[PDB]
Symmetry: C3
Subunit: 93 residues, 3 copies
């Protein structure tokens, strides 16, 4: 398992860790072997714009709607970002 949030929204660490932990919980849908990360990229753009944006890559679930939906609420509510500016990719050592 692996989850990466890539975003230009700056959160304090305590808040980042809550969010990552909440996403791990979600990622019920299908643990002690998982790697999550919040990668702060201030210059990240989408739609020709550097406004708040988050890209989520989940590697790994087939179910996938439940996870996407769940994550999208977490990030809208914890990152104060418009849900139009959330993209969730699922890729399925």
């Amino acid at each position: 398992p692996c989850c990466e949030v890539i975003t230009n929204v700056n959160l304090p660490d305590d808040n980042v860790q809550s969010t990552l932990s909440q996403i791990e919980n979600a990622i019920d849908v299908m643990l002690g072997y998982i790697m999550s990360n919040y990668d702060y990229q201030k210059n990240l753009r989408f739609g020709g714009s550097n406004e708040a944006y988050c890209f989520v890559r989940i590697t790994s679930i087939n179910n996938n709607s439940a996870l996407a939906d769940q994550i999208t609420k977490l990030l809208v509510s914890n990152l104060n970002v418009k849900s139009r500016r959330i993209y969730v990719e699922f890729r399925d050592a």
Copy 2:
């Protein structure tokens, strides 16, 4: 589609954004792909090395012919804007379920 510039060259944000914006234009122009529907990013990695050396360097990943025109175009932008030798610029084209958050 997605362009990521990965580099140990530190630029101020205003400059980073100009560059990213110029690159988006290029992708759109040279490939005819829908502008706006692109990610770009500038990932500052100070300890990034190439050839056993931490000197100025650019890795450009383009994910998801005409391609020479694009590579060339980008290479000038980064040479100009980053003051990096073109002998330290590499431009890599590389290649599942997807959702927008408005669907929820």
Copy 3:
């Protein structure tokens, strides 16, 4: 050819460069190292197993993989003070590149 170490272990730059250089050697031992990238990406909030304790993800792109993995794992265990349970090594064999 490319190695990226992704980790929440903060090292000073001189140390980071030594390690990256030691990894380049390894990759080279087990072609030559002038057509090769490496990087140390510090991600402080990186987690594994629900925990933000020390950890290393290594992605190796475009390259007896066991010899390389084993070698790198010792380097990182030694130089990052991380448990080897908390080190994972992926190889990707994923197309073209284009200055000089």
